[PDB]
Amino acid sequence: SEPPFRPREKLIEKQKHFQSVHKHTYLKGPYDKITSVAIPLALAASSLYLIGRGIYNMSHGIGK
Amino acid sequence: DAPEPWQLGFQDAATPIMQGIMDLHHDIFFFLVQIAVFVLWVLSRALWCFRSKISPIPQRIVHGTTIEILWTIFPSIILMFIAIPSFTLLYSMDDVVVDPAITIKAIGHQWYWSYEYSDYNNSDEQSLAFDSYMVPEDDLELGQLRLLEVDNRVVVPAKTHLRVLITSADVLHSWAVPSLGVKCDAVPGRLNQISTFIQREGVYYGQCSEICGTNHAFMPIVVEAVSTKDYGSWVSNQI
Amino acid sequence: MIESQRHSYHLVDPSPWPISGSLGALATTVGGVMYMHSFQGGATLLSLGLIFILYTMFVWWRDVLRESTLEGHHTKVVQLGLRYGFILFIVSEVMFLFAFFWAFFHSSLAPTVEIGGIWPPLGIWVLDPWEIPFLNTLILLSSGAAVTWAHHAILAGKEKRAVYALVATVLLALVFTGFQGMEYYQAPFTISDSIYGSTFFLATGFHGFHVIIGTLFLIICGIRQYLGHLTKEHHVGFEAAAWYWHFVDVVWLFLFVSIYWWGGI
Amino acid sequence: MTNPVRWLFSTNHKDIGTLYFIFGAIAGVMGTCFSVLIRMELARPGDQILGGNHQLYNVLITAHAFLMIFFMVMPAMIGGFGNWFVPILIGAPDMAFPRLNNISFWLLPPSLLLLLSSALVEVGSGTGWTVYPPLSGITSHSGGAVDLAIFSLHLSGVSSILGSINFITTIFNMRGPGMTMHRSPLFVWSVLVTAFLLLLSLPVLAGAITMLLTDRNFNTTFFDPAGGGDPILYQHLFWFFGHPEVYILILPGFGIISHIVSTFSGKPVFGYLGMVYAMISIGVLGFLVWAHHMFTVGLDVDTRAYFTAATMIIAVPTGIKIFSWIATMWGGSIQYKTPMLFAVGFIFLFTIGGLTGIVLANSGLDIALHDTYYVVAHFHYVLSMGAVFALFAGFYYWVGKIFGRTYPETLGQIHFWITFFGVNLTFFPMHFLGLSGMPRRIPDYPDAYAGWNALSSFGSYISVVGICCFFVVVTITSTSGNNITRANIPWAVEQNSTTLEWLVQSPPAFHTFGELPAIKETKS
Amino acid sequence: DAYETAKWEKITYLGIVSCTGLAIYNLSKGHPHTEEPPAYPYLHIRNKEFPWGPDGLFE
Amino acid sequence: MSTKYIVSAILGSFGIAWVCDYYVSEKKIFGGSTPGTITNKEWGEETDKKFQAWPRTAGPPVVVNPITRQNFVVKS
Amino acid sequence: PIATGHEREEIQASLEGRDILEINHPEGPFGTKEAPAIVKSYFDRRIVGCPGGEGEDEHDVVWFWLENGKPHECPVCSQYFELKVVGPGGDPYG
Amino acid sequence: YYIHAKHMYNLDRMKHRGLKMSLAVFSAFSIGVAVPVYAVIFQQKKT
Ligand code: HEA
Ligand code: HEA
Ligand SMILES: [Cu+2]
Ligand SMILES: [Mg+2]
Ligand SMILES: [Zn+2]
């Protein structure tokens, strides 16, 4: 019987931190602010623009 | 033999296969019109005699016995009765006891057919090969049909056996003449065998039944059944 | 709290990862077509969509881990439901690889006239089914034994040797994918060869892709077990990993037997 | 911003059901526009509105088939009615695995965009509904349209797999207390069985079309004749998907019809165990026959005999189901509202379609009738009549519930009669032409067949009138200034209901359950 | 309880030892290819040229 | 109650379908063509007289649809 | 081990020996002659389903929206259903 | 927000609801019968 390489109280501190905020699940933490409002957002914007341009070019038969 | 305006049911038969097909469909339709009329009658009498103004009390029965087994069993014997003839037709149509007398390859090219009665040549290169093109709109005489008339039709001796080897060269196709009751698929790799035996003279029309590329339905098939002497004269003249 | 909610099931909170993942899938598919046929935006669009799917999947699993480990929303019943769902997913994958095996068999029982009516086609130098493929089977067998060792590490209360067993299994899976890569490079026949080469390479490639994803699943479970996220009573991630790896090993066993033994005979 | 969160983000199985319904309506209208274009082209012999370009006609038939067989019935039976009325009816809180629910629904619209862009690229996909290999090969198309369509099928298939896993785990795990498996209603049961079929069969289609894709682009030889690999392999795989595919479009219809008959006959479903076992057996025997769609390709005699027998045996249980429904109307106190109208029409027209199917199931008869409009009549009655009429019946029966308002009755009956007359006029001459012998999927016909195709073309416009009436009904429902009552409808006013979903509220609040139901479960 | 862990530990160690031996066996093989087969019709087909056309992937 | 309304609406629907058909396939408000085989109005005539005796490539003219039309030659 | 929130409450109950929702299975003898056939509810009014049955007979299922002030008898098998709140009796949605 | 509402929709509240729903259904029909026609129009606009 051995705890796995962590004190396991860092996890308890993290549990306190997560249960001690008043937001949705995906916005908890300071990491998730940056992550889940900037990376997917800009990434989806670029994806949408490239998808539109690609459909346009394929339909019109231009830019082979 | 040819399609008719405002027609009900099958065309005319020129093959024992087509006689079998007509008989099997008529037996099936007899059984199934019995089924359909009985079901409609029971549904109608159930809806009408209990129409909220005669029986306003639900009468509350939910478990049924000795009637569920009855409508489980009786459709079974119905199916047995309507599967007795189908199996007999299959296992009396498969057998070819007699040797075929000729051999007519029907290679299904892309938007036009081809044929080779190759069994008349002393060499290796094949004689008596031609192409079966649809006649365009303006190339018709005053009588023929539209998009169903062919240049240089298939010629076949009547009252003698056949063996047509359907196959393709570009894409999927199907050799399909309904009056003879012949439909099979030409797959670019295989060589399907159809044994048929016409019973009377005259011309029979049919079309492609598979999606070829763009001129689908403009890829028709015409088979003439003519007397053996005339068939011999025609082949000797074509060689 | 449950006493006010009055039921132990799970009620999740909104997250845009469904829609984001769907947009990533559309990106991947249009990029795939635009790279399959030569076009200007093809490669970049395909790569962008693929990394979009990877990113949304990452944040999705991160969200599930966050909920279930720190918030503690998983109760016994949803714990069971996760096992149900993953068994169903494995059944779906079984049917997929069944379809591929049917393709192979329908192409190899009665070989057509156009490959000589014989199998394997003349001029395709079949791999000896005993030099590399046997070693791959032995490697996956040892990997399965190591996964079982990891499971009995977690169960027996010995939560330290679990990481040792998991890292041993990851090493064996990496050795397997390396030897599969060596086999692909040293192949005496390519994909564009006859139906034999074609079905061989398609089936083996999808099996290797499943090996990659199972290996990365095992890596995730190893990191979690090192960090302490798993306990003797409550662990589903590891059970999913073990079942998936056993699936991959069984598929490899069928693949080895049929293709490598029979096809070479 | 709160509304976009609540729609694009929320899990909320009810809201996903609403989104599924809206998508189903849009896809249905698109499919009907394609059908009307097809009918306009086929109205008279010669080039009618296409003015040539039979390739565009083949593209139209393909797009119509995909749109209505994948984006109209499935997003309405499974996503539409399934998502809503599985957890409400079974007595459970929000569905299991809500995020899978959301991802499946939001996967669907990109699949729609792929399908339309496939119909729009360089020339088009003129390969029919069932993409066959050699025509969809790179020698004969060389466009990319088939690639886009194949990816559309991939996205739709993945979404349906996710939904099926959702429903299976929910039924097996997320039931209420005391509710044994044999107390879940038949809608739940049909959704379970159809979800099993969708989970088992659909991956085979994904494998087959992946193989077709790598045959086209990455230059394999799976379906190239030179090198083995006959197209028969693809026929086998696609139809091993195809028949389980068609016993999925109708099973939720069966469930909804059972519920409607039960609630209109004042009595529950006669022979409950018979219904359950018959439906399970239909599900099982939907797999053991898959080549009854390719009798005329060159299989040996014994396979044809076996598939004949298998189709007859799959015919029996549907007979048990229909006779059970007829029995559970012998009680009394019927009341002819529009849901009952549509259920009755379903039973009648599905009977006609099924009998035609039996005629088609034999071998020799299929030799004579393969790929002729006899088959088109068969599956248009079966699929269109059955699925769409069950859909309309469910829609009325439960727009009593979703929005909280209620449709006007005279317009409901007018719509039923218009649609019934139109769509039953426009598909019986298909039987007659198929007997005459015209091949399927042709833009022009010989002059002989021009007699009926003028009459059938007269049937599409009536159905268009019916659909426009239906949308007038939907708008007048969503703006009806008179809420749910007892004079209007007697269903939701029940203080005692056979099905759990009628005694809750006008719409469910947000969690559908302040507290879960119970079961007395006597014999202490 | 722990006997099972010990037993699977032992057999996994046996497995990796045998596998490492077999890897040593398989390696150090030269692998000389035989001559290319005659160009049968069904070999090296190009229905549609690859995006990286001239030679297949992994070559 | 409403049978008046239902029947009236059904007849109106038939009227509207007829009007749309007449505009879209008899006068073609959307461009199109008509075959030369139907506008000649004498083509069916010869088609029937040819079912009496259909021309052939090798052999004398021969009949078609002998059963369903009851048309055929006698002792000779 | 490690747990907090819903799983913690579940495991605390399963360690203390109490069942969390044991009020959700009435499991009572059929009928009401001098003893009502009783249920339990955490709210004012609650859904209850009767399958009926001494042990041999049964009717399929009937859902009735049982309320506090008025006992309700099963429509088909005719047994009473008297409710007894074990929580704060309030309208289920407040 | 209306998670704690007596009705999930509460459709009555919005501003007269009539023009909004009428436009909604009409635009649904327009998107249903515009794209299928537009695909054919574009294909004839092509070669
Ligand atoms: C979902 C299945 C479905 C439906 C509903 C329909 C509907 C119709 N179909 Fe379709 N059809 C197919 C599936 C379907 N079809 C398939 C699979 C093929 C094969 C293609 C091929 O062989 O390659 C085909 C082919 C096909 C052809 C042959 C094409 C060819 O031979 O070239 C024709 C010919 O006219 C045709 C006509 C019609 C007509 C007139 C309707 C009319 O019934 C129009 C429908 C009318 C309705 C009443 C339904 C609309 C309902 C709504 C929009 C309301 C929705 C409500 C909500 C969701 C709330 N169909
Ligand atoms: C929509 C779902 C659906 C349903 C329910 C059915 C029902 C049946 N179908 Fe159908 N079928 C399709 C979907 C469906 N089909 C499609 C999409 C096609 C076209 C595919 C293509 O484009 O190629 C097709 C075409 C098709 C074909 C021909 C394919 C080809 O050659 O072109 C065949 C033949 O084997 C067939 C068989 C059957 C059989 C035996 C039934 C039976 O299950 C019917 C059972 C119903 C009953 C028979 C009615 C109720 C029974 C009674 C009231 C009891 C009394 C009856 C007896 C005495 C048993 N179907
Ligand atoms: Cu089928
Ligand atoms: Mg066919
Ligand atoms: Zn009771």
Numbering used by the authors:
A (entry chain i): 2 to 65
B (entry chain b): 12 to 250
C (entry chain c): 1 to 265
D (entry chain a): 1 to 524
E (entry chain f): 37 to 95
F (entry chain d): 1 to 76
G (entry chain e): 52 to 145
H (entry chain j): 47 to 93
Question: Can you list sentences taken from the study reporting this PDB entry?
Answer:
Complex IV (CIV), also called cytochrome c oxidase, transfers electrons from cyt c to molecular oxygen, reducing it to water. In the IMM, respiratory complexes can be found as separate entities or as higher-order assemblies known as supercomplexes. Here we present the cryoEM structures of CIII2 and SC III2+IV from the vascular plant Vigna radiata (mung bean) at nominal resolutions of 3.2 Å and 3.8 Å, respectively.
By docking the individually refined CIII2 and CIV models into the SC III2+IV composite map, we were able to define the binding interface of the plant supercomplex. Site 1 (matrix side), shows a single hydrophobic contact between one residue of VrQCR8 (Pro31) and one residue of VrCOX2 (Trp59). Instead, V. radiata’s site 2 (IMS side) provides the bulk of the protein-protein interactions of the supercomplex, with a hydrophobic interaction between VrQCR6 and VrCOX5c (Leu26 and Leu51 respectively) as well as an interface between VrQCR6 (Pro19 and Lys20) and VrCOX4 (Arg114-Phe117). Despite the potential for lipid bridges at the matrix leaflet of the IMM, there are no direct contacts in the membrane and no protein contact at the IMS leaflet of the IMM. The limited matrix-side contacts in V. radiata are in stark contrast to the supercomplex interface in S. cerevisiae, where binding is dominated by interactions between ScCor1 (VrMPP-β) and ScCOX5a (VrCox4) on the matrix side. Unsurprisingly given the large differences in contacts, there is a significant difference in the angle between CIII2 and CIV in V. radiata versus yeast, resulting in a more ‘open’ orientation in V. radiata. This orientation leads to a difference of 18° in the angle between the CIII2 and CIV as measured by the relative positions of the bh-hemes in CIII2 and the a-hemes in CIV. The difference in orientation also results in a larger estimated distance between the CIII2- and CIV-bound cyt c in V. radiata (~70 Å) than in yeast (~61 Å).
